[PDB]
Amino acid sequence: TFVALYDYESRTETDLSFKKGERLQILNSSEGDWWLAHSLTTGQTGYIPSNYVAP
Amino acid sequence: TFVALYDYESRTETDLSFKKGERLQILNSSEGDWWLAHSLTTGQTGYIPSNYVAP
Numbered sequence: 585t586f587v588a589l590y591d592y593e594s595r596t597e598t599d600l601s602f603k604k605g606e607r608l609q610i611l612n613s614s615e616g617d618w619w620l621a622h623s624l625t626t627g628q629t630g631y632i633p634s635n636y637v638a639p
Numbered sequence: 640t641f642v643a644l645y646d647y648e649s650r651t652e653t654d655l656s657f658k659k660g661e662r663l664q665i666l667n668s669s670e671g672d673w674w675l676a677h678s679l680t681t682g683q684t685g686y687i688p689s690n691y692v693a694p
Contacts, residue, residue, distance in 0.1 A: 586676075586692040596651055600676055600685030607679040608692055618673040618686065621641075621655055624662040630655030631673065637641040637663055 585609055640664055 586608045594601040602608065616635030623629070641663045649656040657663065671690030678684070 585679075586694055588692050590691050592687065592691050594685070596653055598651055598653075598685055599673075600678060600683055600687050602678055602680075602683075602687065606681070608676040608687065609679060611675045611677055611684070613675050617689075618654075620666045620668050621663040622666055623655060623657055624640075624664060625657075626661070628655055628657075629666070630649070630653055632647065632655050632657065632663065634672075636645050636647050637643050639641055 588602045588604050588606045588608065591604050592599075592602050600608075614635065615633035618631045619634050621629070621632045621637075643657045643659050643661045643663065646659050647654075647657050655663075669690065670688035673686045674689050676684070676687045
């Protein structure tokens with residue numbers, strides 16, 4: 585359980601909007617936390633599921 | 640620097656598609672890692688930027 589420090593306005597159909605002070609429960613999914621990444625193969629950039637990669 | 644263990648097909652305009660074996664560089668943004676969360680105030684669910692919340 586976490587609490588929002590700031591308002592956040594959703595920018596896509598997959599993010600969650602919330603107001604400062606909302607209580608949030610973090611859920612476990614197969615994909616893990618998501619990270620912003622850059623592909624050294626294609627030059628493309630965006631978020632990736634962390635459980636799909638390894639150092 | 641990380642390496643993909645699996646193919647991933649992008650599902651939105653913000654994620655990054657990649658093939659098994661691609662090399663990926665993780666980038667630092669203000670928002671932090673993104674987590675799947677559930678709002679105890681609105682019942683809504685989706686990803687949130689982790690730097691916006693606190694326990």
